[PDB]
Amino acid sequence: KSIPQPTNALKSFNWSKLPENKLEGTVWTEIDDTKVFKILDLEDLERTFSAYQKELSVIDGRRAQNCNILLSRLKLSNDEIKRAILTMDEQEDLPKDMLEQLLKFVPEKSDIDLLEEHKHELDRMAKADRFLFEMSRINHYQQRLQSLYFKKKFAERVAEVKPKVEAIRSGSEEVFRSGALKQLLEVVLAFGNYMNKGQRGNAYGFKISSLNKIADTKSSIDKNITLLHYLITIVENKYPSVLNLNEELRDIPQAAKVNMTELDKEISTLRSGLKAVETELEYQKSQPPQPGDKFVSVVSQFITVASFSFSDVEDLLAEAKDLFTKAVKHFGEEAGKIQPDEFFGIFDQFLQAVSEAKQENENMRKKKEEEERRARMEAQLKEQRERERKMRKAK
């Protein structure tokens, strides 16, 4: 083994050791620190990196300064911090954003091993060192801290995810049962089968993305009248039911915005975080009640509502994905190969286009009433002077 050890304790080097079972291939086979000790002025090393300064400081300066920032922000003593953890923060001294930061500065195995070396010198310890040591004394510090954070973030995390599950469920259902859309597809099929002479045009169906190409066909009379303007106009007196499309697909714009990777990522943290709280509740239940420890009392209340609430979220999600699968197939898309953002994005762009066309049409119609009054007035005003000329002729 062989290395010598100091006269007094030293500051630590925050390294990560390689397991010995990972050597044999490596540089370290060729390396041997035991000769360095003879070469180095160890006395100088000890003086310049002593543990003392007189305060005990062993945790590295970077990590220590990061703590001192958090502690100056949290404004709690270690006694206060332990009470806040133990009572699951009944005085509300640990906001979400502080718990988050506190979850980054959780003492590690090697940190505690080190401060253990100085357990008889807590009163000499620098602020960060004493904080990390005191925190390592609280039973199941990390998993109480994780549980408190999860608890405080559960309501907003369910509120984030639920509207997205509703959008997929609703849009999927809407697209599947909309009679305005099904009648429009049949009229548009007719249009293409007539316009696309011969072959190119014995279709029994088309891809839903084709909807977003209708406005691309332009009138040979006026080039700002597209085939979509024309559809929307024809349909008024021929298939009026089609005009209920914006109403029947009202939740498509919102379903269009649901990212499925991010949805699943949210359900994933909710699920695994809830299992982690349940696990810590089983550990904590199997431990003798201590005064000022309110974990079992509080976490049980939370799981009751949280487990019911998430179970329901999981149900709405399972069923929403089912309907989406049915809706995808209903329009000839490959299940698995298309996401809601894309599928409902086809429909949402179309609704934006149908909406734009509706308006532009409406602005045309109002020129053709503005200028029909020109033909109505000039018809009556022409004949009025004509009656006063036949009077002037006779007279």
Positions in 312-341 near a copy of itself (CB under 8 A): 329-332
Q: Name residues contacting a copy of itself, limited to 367-386 (CB under 8 A).
A: none
Least separation in angstroms between residue 7's CB and a copy of itself is 11
Ramachandran assignment for 292, one of left (phi > 0), alpha (psi -120 to 50 degrees), beta (any other): left
CB contact set of 74 (below 8 Å; sequence gap of 6+)? 81, 93, 94, 98, 102
Q: Name residues contacting a copy of itself, limited to 92-131 (CB under 8 A).
A: 110, 113-114, 117
Backbone angles phi, psi at 153, to 5 degrees: -95, 0
Least separation in angstroms between residue 205's CB and a copy of itself is 4
Q: Rounded CA gap, 303 and 274, in Å?
A: 8
Least separation in angstroms between residue 158's CB and a copy of itself is 34
| Burial of 372: CB neighbours in 10 Å, binned 0-12, 13-18, 19+ | exposed
Least separation in angstroms between residue 81's CB and a copy of itself is 24
Q: Name residues contacting a copy of itself, limited to 13-42 (CB under 8 A).
A: 13-18, 20, 22-23, 25-28, 30-33, 36-37, 39-42
Q: Name residues contacting a copy of itself, limited to 213-242 (CB under 8 A).
A: 213-214, 216-221, 223, 225-227, 230, 234, 238-239
User: Of the candidates 80, 153, 206, 269, which one interacts with a copy of itself according to CB under 8 A?
Assistant: 206
Q: What angle do CA 255, 258, 262 make, to 5 degrees?
A: 160
Nearer to a copy of itself, 151 or 229 (CB): 229
Among 317, 304, 180, 158, which Cα is nearest to 241's? Answer: 180
Nearer to a copy of itself, 4 or 288 (CB): 4
Q: Name residues contacting a copy of itself, limited to 52-91 (CB under 8 A).
A: 52-53, 57, 60-63
Residue 9 within binding range of a copy of itself, rule CB under 8 A: yes
Task: Say what the alpha-carbon torsion angle 181, 174, 216, 356 is, to the nearest 10 degrees.
Answer: 100
Least separation in angstroms between residue 333's CB and a copy of itself is 9
DSSP 224: T
For residue 20, what are its two tokens? 């010995």
Q: Name residues contacting a copy of itself, limited to 163-192 (CB under 8 A).
A: 182, 185-192
Least separation in angstroms between residue 365's CB and a copy of itself is 16
Q: Rounded CA gap, 188 and 305, in Å?
A: 50
Residue 139 within binding range of a copy of itself, rule CB under 8 A: no
Least separation in angstroms between residue 272's CB and a copy of itself is 22
Among 225, 240, 228, which Cα is nearest to 183's? Answer: 240
Residue 159 within binding range of a copy of itself, rule CB under 8 A: no
CA atoms within 13 A on the CB side of 331: 25
